[PDB]
Amino acid sequence: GTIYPRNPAMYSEEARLKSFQNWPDYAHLTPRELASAGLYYTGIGDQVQCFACGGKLKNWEPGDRAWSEHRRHFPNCFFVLG
Ligand SMILES: CN[C@@H](C)C(=O)N[C@H]1CN(C(=O)c2ccc(N)cc2)c2ccccc2N(Cc2c(OC)ccc3ccccc23)C1=O
Ligand SMILES: [Zn+2]
C-alpha cells in the first residue's frame, strides 16, 4: 500500500486501550478518548503516540482534546485525514 502505520499492532483500538494499564493518576485525559484518537501509551510520563503517523503528544493541559491536539501537531497524519 501507499501509506503504512508506524505501529501496526496498535492498529487495533482495543490494543491501544490496553496500553493505558499504568497511565498516571495525574493524567486527566481518559484512555477511551486517547485510544479513539489513534493514540497509545508509550509508558513514559503522560506521553502517548499515534499508531499511524508516529507522532507523540505529552504534557497535556486542561481543556486539551485528543483529536484536536493530534490534528494540531500532526495535520498530515493519515488517521487524522481519514
Ligand atoms: C497543550 N497540549 C499538549 C498535548 C501539547 O501540545 N503538548 C506538547 C508538548 N511538547 C513538549 O512537551 C516537548 C516536545 C519535544 C521536546 N523535545 C520537549 C518538549 C511539545 C513542544 C513543542 C512542540 C510540540 C510538542 N508536543 C508534540 C510533540 C512534537 O510536536 C511536533 C514533536 C516531538 C514530540 C516529542 C515528544 C512529545 C511530544 C512531541 C506536545 O505534545
Ligand atoms: Zn497520527
Task: Locate the domains of the chain by residue range.
Answer: 1-82
Domain 1-82: CATH class, spelled out = mainly alpha
Q: How many residues belong to the chain?
A: 82
Q: Residues with Cβ < 8 Å from 71, sequence gap 6 or more?
A: 77, 80
- C-alpha separations of 78 from 5, 21, 61 in Å: 9, 26, 25
Residue with cell 508516529: 54
b/e 55-65 (16+ beta carbons within 10 angstroms → b): bebeebeeeee
Pocket test for ligand 1, best of 39, 73, 77, 80 (most atoms within 8 A of CB): 73
63 lines ligand 1 (CB under 6 A): no
60 lines ligand 1 (CB under 6 A): yes
- C-alpha separations of 51 from 4, 26, 62, 82 in Å: 10, 23, 24, 14
The whole-angstrom separation of Cα 75 and Cα 68 is 10
Q: Report how far ligand 1's centroid is from the alpha carbon of 17 (Å).
A: 21
